[PDB]
Design a protein around this ligand. Structure first.
Ligand SMILES: [Mg+2]
Length: 476
RNA sequence: CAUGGGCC
RNA sequence: GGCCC
């Protein structure tokens, strides 16, 4: 987005801190090129002479404006896509009762219990439950107050900026390119889950190539459902986006919301409103009060769906912007946020699509750095979706999510205070697809120190997951 | 025990 | 809690 003004206020949101991620016994054995994100602008690991505050807000390269012509084209690609979407899901998007918006419904889980309630609840020393009954299903004073403020759209707000304490590649670590989270006020998140919470639930339960959404899938079983699909087309593309979230032009955002959340589809007149507020946002990074126009507050309710939807419309908008008579069924794709996998028998030319995407402020590049230029012929067994490859299991000829050993070496090398054992269990199910060998090697440094799930146990579990029949039938 | 949403 | 976005 475009930073209109960087003013300095009196208040100051304290975010500075250290990482809770401590090295593990695996570190000294692997020494991965990954490490905790620089949470301090004075961190020695940072290149001598790099303002952490400078990089954090360098993602905003401006809010690309669109010509009425392209706006009409986008509006059509939006209304068109919105047709296929709302067709499958349906038009039962009635406001989710405050109760349902808390406890969650079929598909939509429940609002996190003890998480940053955002502002101004954070400047008054209060927790999430200190304003809402996460045990019951209702809210209190503050909520009901703003709840009535949004009911009349009189409501206004701000976003609290946090430094996502995670593990990242040492290169971007020294580059002070630590990722940040835009924590919005809990009240907002609750209202959004009421306005379109119904919608999201339906999308989650219908993830797939049809609606081009992977939000709600289970890489363990859906990989087999997806793999076959893309391994059916001629060309498979794995596009990448540079600051996908922060580069959503206002015109593309407002048109999308106005097209995908109309009242004719059953949405509440405030569903479109509540979302449009996400355009012009005001961040509160410590003592500074930065204002931005455009982009997406990576950390708001249904933030992934909004991105997934946009990503879907961009592909259609771009293709039509370069070709003629291009319909949805002209190609096939699936995405989870910025991540995306495109496929189409047609020998499309993404390389000549870059500018068309740029007309939206988005910059696409080939996943495979080699010969920076979208080529052709690539199969599903080459692309990487959700940090996972598409490989076949010699044991059952099934498709299974496989993560690069280096990525696994980064995960098993760090962990917070007292979580190793538990983490080993979780991550264990992820390395089961790396094969017996790689598996035993990934947890070798923990033998006798922790309980390591046998490759056997988890393998048989997966088999029953991907296809309950594939397992039982192997008894006859 | 930094967030929205998966998912396990 | 862990991973993914
Ligand atoms: Mg990709």
């Amino acid at each position: 987005g475009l930073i209109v003004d960087t003013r300095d206020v009196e208040e100051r949101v304290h975010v500075m801190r250290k990482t809770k991620l401590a090295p593990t016994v695996a570190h000294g054995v692997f020494n991965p090129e990954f490490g905790p994100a620089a949470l301090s602008n004075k961190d020695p690991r940072l290149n001598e002479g790099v303002v952490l505050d400078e990089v954090i807000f360098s993602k905003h390269k401006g809010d690309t404006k669109m010509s009425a012509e392209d706006k009409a084209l986008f509006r059509r690609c939006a209304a068109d896509y919105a047709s296929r979407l709302h067709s499958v899901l349906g038009t039962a998007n009635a406001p989710l009762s405050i109760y349902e918006a808390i406890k969650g419904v079929d598909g939509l889980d429940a609002m996190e219990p003890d998480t940053a309630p955002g502002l101004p609840w954070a400047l008054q020393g209060k927790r999430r439950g200190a304003l809402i009954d996460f045990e019951n299903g209702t809210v209190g004073p503050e909520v009901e107050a703003a709840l009535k403020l949004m009911e009349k759209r009189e409501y206004k707000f701000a976003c609290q900026t946090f430094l996502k304490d995670e593990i990242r590649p040492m290169e971007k670590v020294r580059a002070g390119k630590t990722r940040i989270v835009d924590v919005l006020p809990v009240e907002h998140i609750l209202y959004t889950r009421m306005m379109i919470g119904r919608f999201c639930a339906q999308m989650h339960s219908n993830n797939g190539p049809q609606i081009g959404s992977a939000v709600g899938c289970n890489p363990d079983v859906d990989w087999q459902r997806f793999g076959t699909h893309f391994a059916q087309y001629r060309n498979v593309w794995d596009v990448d986006y540079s600051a996908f979230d922060a580069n959503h032009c206002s015109d593309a955002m407002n048109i999308m919301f106005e097209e995908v959340f109309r009242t004719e589809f059953g949405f509440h007149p405030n569903a479109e409103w509540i979302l449009k507020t996400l355009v012009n946002t005001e961040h509160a990074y410590e003592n500074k009060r930065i204002t931005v126009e455009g982009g997406m507050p990576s950390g708001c309710s249904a933030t992934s769906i909004i991105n997934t939807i946009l990503n879907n419309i961009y592909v259609l908008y771009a293709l039509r912007r370069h070709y003629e008579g291009v319909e949805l069924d002209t190609y096939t794709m699936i995405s989870y946020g910025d991540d995306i996998v495109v496929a189409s028998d047609y020998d499309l030319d993404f390389e000549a699509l870059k500018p068309h995407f740029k007309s939206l402020g988005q910059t696409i590049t080939p996943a495979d750095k080699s010969d920076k230029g979208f080529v052709l012929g690539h199969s599903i067994t080459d692309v990487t979706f959700l940090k996972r490859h598409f490989h076949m299991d010699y044991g059952t000829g099934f498709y299974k999510p496989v993560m690069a050993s280096k990525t696994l070496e980064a995960i098993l090398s760090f962990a917070r205070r007292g979580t190793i054992q538990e983490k080993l269990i979780s991550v264990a199910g992820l390395a089961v697809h790396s094969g017996p060998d790689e598996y035993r090697r990934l947890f070798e440094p923990f033998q006798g120190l922790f309980e390591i799930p046998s490759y056997r146990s988890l393998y048989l579990r997966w088999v029953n997951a991907v296809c309950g029949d594939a397992a039982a039938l192997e008894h006859h």
